[PDB]
Amino acid sequence: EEKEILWNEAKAFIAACYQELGKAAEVKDRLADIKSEIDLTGSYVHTKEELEHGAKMAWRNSNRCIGRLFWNSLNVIDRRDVRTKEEVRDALFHHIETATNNGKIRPTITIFPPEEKGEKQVEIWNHQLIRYAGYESDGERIGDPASCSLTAACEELGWRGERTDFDLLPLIFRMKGDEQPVWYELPRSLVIEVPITHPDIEAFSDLELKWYGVPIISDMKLEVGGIHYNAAPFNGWYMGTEIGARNLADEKRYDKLKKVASVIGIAADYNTDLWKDQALVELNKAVLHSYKKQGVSIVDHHTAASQFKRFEEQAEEAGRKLTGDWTWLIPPISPAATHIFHRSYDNSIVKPNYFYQDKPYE
Amino acid sequence: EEKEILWNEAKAFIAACYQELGKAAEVKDRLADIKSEIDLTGSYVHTKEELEHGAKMAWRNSNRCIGRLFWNSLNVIDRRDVRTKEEVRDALFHHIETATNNGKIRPTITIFPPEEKGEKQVEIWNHQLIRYAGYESDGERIGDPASCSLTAACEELGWRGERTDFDLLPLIFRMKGDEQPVWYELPRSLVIEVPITHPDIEAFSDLELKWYGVPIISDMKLEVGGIHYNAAPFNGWYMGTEIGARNLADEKRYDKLKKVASVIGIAADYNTDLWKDQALVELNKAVLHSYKKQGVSIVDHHTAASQFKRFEEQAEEAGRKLTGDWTWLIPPISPAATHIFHRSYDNSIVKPNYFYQDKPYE
Ligand code: HEM
Ligand code: HEM
Ligand SMILES: C=NCc1cncc(OCc2ccc3ccc(N)nc3c2)c1
Ligand SMILES: C=NCc1cncc(OCc2ccc3ccc(N)nc3c2)c1
Ligand SMILES: C[C@H](O)[C@H](O)[C@H]1CNc2nc(N)[nH]c(=O)c2N1
Ligand SMILES: C[C@H](O)[C@H](O)[C@H]1CNc2nc(N)[nH]c(=O)c2N1
Ligand SMILES: [Cl-]
Ligand SMILES: [Cl-]
Secondary structure (H helix, E strand, O other): OHHHHHHHHHHHHHHHHHHHOOOHHHHHHHHHHHHHHHHHHOOOOOOHHHHHHHHHHHHHOOOOOOOHHHHHHOEEEEOOOOOOHHHHHHHHHHHHHHHHHHHOOOOEEEEOOOOOOOOOOEEEOOOEOOOEOEEEEOOEEEEOHHHHHHHHHHHOOOOOOOOOOOOEOOEEEEEOOOOOOEEEOOOHHHOOEEEOOOOOOHHHHHHOOEEEOOOEEOOOEEEEOOEEEOOOOEEOOEEHHHHHHHHOOOOOOOOOHHHHHHHOOOOOOOHHHOHHHHHHHHHHHHHHHHHHHOOOOEEOHHHHHHHHHHHHHHHHHHOOOOOOOHHHHOOOOOHHHOHHHHOOOOOOOOOOEEEOOOOOOO | OHHHHHHHHHHHHHHHHHHHOOOHHHHHHHHHHHHHHHHHHOOOOOOHHHHHHHHHHHHHOOOOOOOHHHHHHOEEEEOOOOOOHHHHHHHHHHHHHHHHHHHOOOOEEEEOOOOOOOOOOEEEOOOEOOOEOEEEEOOEEEEOHHHHHHHHHHHOOOOOOOOOOOOEOOEEEEEOOOOOOEEEOOOHHHOOEEEOOOOOOHHHHHHOOEEEOOOEEOOOEEEEOOEEEOOOOEEOOEEHHHHHHHHOOOOOOOOOHHHHHHHOOOOOOOHHHOHHHHHHHHHHHHHHHHHHHOOOOEEOHHHHHHHHHHHHHHHHHHOOOOOOOHHHHOOOOOHHHOHHHHOOOOOOOOOOEEEOOOOOOO
16 A cells, blocks of 8 residues: 555656656656556656656745745755765765855755655754754853754764854764764865844944855655655755844844844834834844855845745746745745735645654654 | 524523623523514614623634733723614714723724614724725825725715825715715814824924824624624724834835835835835834824834733633634734744634625725
8 A cells, every 4th residue: 555655646746747847748658667666666766857857846836935936946966876874974065065156055955865665764863954053051051042952962972062152063864774873073164154244333243143154954855756755955045034033033043132232222122112123124134235245145035025926927827826835935024015925825735845754853 | 594593693692701791690591581582573682791791702702803902991882772874973973082082092892783684774884984085096196095995985975085195084874774875074173193203213204194093993793692783893002013014014005115215314226225124114113103202002013912922821811712813913024023923823713703794885
């Protein structure tokens, strides 16, 4: 019956994928070979064309993503050939390098061997390949609280963080047949960081804020035609709000709004002064300004929303249903200033897609 | 069967209402009289206590409302005795006066006779008792575009607006047995308006912006225990964002953000400058400052969210399920700065409640 779910998903994917690539006449024969392959082996292997397009379809189907306009230009790196942790490590190093591209970020996905019997070949522990550590001890909070549990896990494995507010977490992943994951410290030369300054508030640098250049989500599962690629790290460029309105602003993150209000010279005493709102705007202006100044790719929420409007228009022209999660698509600042706020979206799940999966820690 | 829906709703309402008022032992007898009344008359008449509490329950059940903490302090005016348009007019005039309360706004509802056979005794055309007219002709747009259709309707009835950007629409309602609605010009002495100034940007007054003091929604239907009060205008005080981030900001409303950016001395050329976001903050600061300065009640979105958190806490303590519409509860500026953004809400509809109903114009 496991050979039935896989067979059904495969038929749906191959038909759709080959339609879009204009290879509709080759569906019948390809479906034949797959049918035999599932019978004989219990699974099937995607061609590079299928895998590449499947990854692109998956991004296109990500309801929560505002940046889906450029789904078809995704850079897909096929690494189903890896067998050693050294190979996984170097593939992850390479992903960071090519995606970063000296600041001109290339949306990229590196695809590792898929689950077999639901048995993972490679199991990545990082939420993102580049992320800051977090510590909580004796009322003392350091770094990114979102990373507290992974950090403690890494420190259980012999790693020790310097306990700055911006410790780079090591890459940590487990190979099939190993009981523990291994960890590799990130070469700093691969990691671009952006110091946060303000275009006209000189004192903003006193906050000593910074963030990393490329968000590379590495703990989600890519599903393509019944095949579960549990290890397939992917990246885009940041939307400024992710950093300015969430990462550095949330009380359960870096919680910097009070300090921003201070350096911009406004009181943080009264709700009616809207000091949090003002601090959010200046901080988000600072983030955008800082990334542009260092020549690292970034998009503001207005421009991103305009691009998403075009994605909507493109979907209609192509005859494809549009799906989306309104609650995630709206930016966390001035959402009513975007068209997204003023329309509704069908939150139906279409495959191929990227999914949450259980963590091996916590 | 119409006597069945009514009977079922009545049983559910009376039981619940009398539980909450601690009059549980009187349910059986009250349900008896109602049962006979429905048999004999085809409907039933609420006691003043039931009507008052039903209106309060309805507010408490309004999923989209962030101000529900004060549901139990609602001022309920029972006007089921009205029979003439002069009486309706004076009741509406009175509502404006008492709710305004010289600026110290009292949340108030005036309840008119309910539908009979679904036949309306009184039919209010206004969306709000106080609202600005809107005009669209020859590429010339004046006033509030949201009011374009009602304004044209009023001008079909012999009314003529001065075509300022802030023409007060007349009260317009239709009595049962009349073919046309009547209209009465609002006495200016009853209407408080607030000129919009900025606490430290003196040039802000050049925009000549203003808004009315009290939002009195007058086109929704109150449903209590099977009884349809189609005419029951109600009001609270404004949350600043309604005016600053929507009414004066929406492109399909007053569309003032470009002009705000000008008077606050920032460029409106680049999305990356976040000029819309900055303009929104200053405009919303101006609104709050202006209402406080004139001694007209208003609440900022942070304070309102804190109050709503208490409503959530109060609901749990009372053993009542909480319902809400996340998409409407989140404020249109800095929503992620409120707790509302970071939790989910069950959007189930509980009666008593306030409902949309079809308009007699358009
Ligand atoms: C090219 C630049 C991109 C931008 C600006 C962008 C923007 C965003 C943003 C702002 C979010 C919300 C993140 C959050 O609230 O935590 C998001 C979610 C998401 N994006 Fe994108 N994105 C981009 C590229 C991509 C790529 C390349 C993929 C994968 C192929 C992708 C897949 C997703 C997914 C799966 C989510 C939802 C994750 C979740 O459910 O938690 N996006 N995107
Ligand atoms: C006391 C001050 C109050 C504040 C600050 C407040 C705040 C709000 C706000 C901001 C909205 C959203 C409006 C929009 O987006 O168009 C809302 C919706 C609503 N409020 Fe309140 N409210 C208050 C009192 C009341 C009262 C007295 C009632 C009725 C008894 C009420 C019932 C509702 C209803 C029914 C809606 C939704 C209307 C719709 O679905 O379009 N609220 N409230
Ligand atoms: C832990 N935060 C929730 C979470 C969980 N699991 C995956 C997540 O991904 C968010 C996400 C995913 C893809 C992105 C692509 C580009 C971008 N700028 N941000 C992006 C953000 C977020
Ligand atoms: C036409 N705009 C949509 C709409 C339709 N029908 C009713 C509406 O009511 C919004 C509403 C309702 C009650 C309120 C009470 C207080 C307040 N400050 N705003 C309030 C706003 C809104
Ligand atoms: C599409 C969406 O339902 C619609 O634009 C809503 C979004 N949330 C809102 N929330 C409030 N308070 N008021 C509104 O008018 C809207 N508009
Ligand atoms: C409760 C709600 O689902 C949750 O807080 C969501 C709201 N919308 C969001 N939207 C984005 N883009 N990112 C988030 O983390 C969240 N949080
Ligand atoms: Cl992030
Ligand atoms: Cl309004």
